[PDB]
């Protein structure tokens, strides 16, 4: 900022950056749908895991 001797805008866009300093948040919104996908996955997984454990000893 001390580079520009005729400054006039650096405090303006400085305040513009500090305005948008709470920039924008992300989304860990998935707490309803992702549990459904891991539910189907763990269901099929435990079914297959117990099935092959039975079929090996059979």
């Amino acid at each position: 900022r001390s580079v520009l001797k005729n400054t006039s805008v650096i405090d303006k866009i400085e305040s513009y950056v500090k305005q948008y300093k709470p920039v924008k948040i992300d989304a860990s919104k998935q707490l309803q749908v992702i549990e459904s996908f891991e539910k189907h996955a763990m269901t099929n997984a435990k079914e297959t895991e117990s099935l092959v454990s039975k079929e090996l000893k059979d």
């Binding site: 866009i13 998935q30 749908v33 996908f37 189907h40």
Partner: protein, 89 residues
């Protein structure tokens, strides 16, 4: 040295009516105040992009979403197509 002295006094004073007192300019026939601080002051925003780049556009990102909360009618298709892959596997 009055050579140096009179040279530097004319050097100081002959544009001093262009810098110290703003009686704009006597030898230059176009006016000087509508060159740099009026026309060319918006020069860098006449040389760069106006109202998007210099105003800088603190812009909200497009909130990209999940698979729109529909397991069923596509998880069954994924399951049956996975059966078809394991047929081909």
């Amino acid at each position: 040295q009055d050579l140096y002295l009179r040279e530097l006094k004319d050097t100081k004073l002959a544009p001093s009516t262009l810098q110290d007192a703003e009686g704009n300019v006597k030898p230059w026939n176009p006016p000087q105040k509508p060159n740099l601080p009026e026309l060319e002051l918006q020069g860098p925003e006449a040389l760069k992009a106006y109202t998007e780049q210099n105003v800088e556009t603190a812009h909200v990102a497009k909130e990209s979403e999940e698979g729109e909360s529909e397991p069923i009618e596509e998880d069954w298709l994924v399951l049956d197509d996975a059966e078809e892959t394991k047929e081909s596997h």
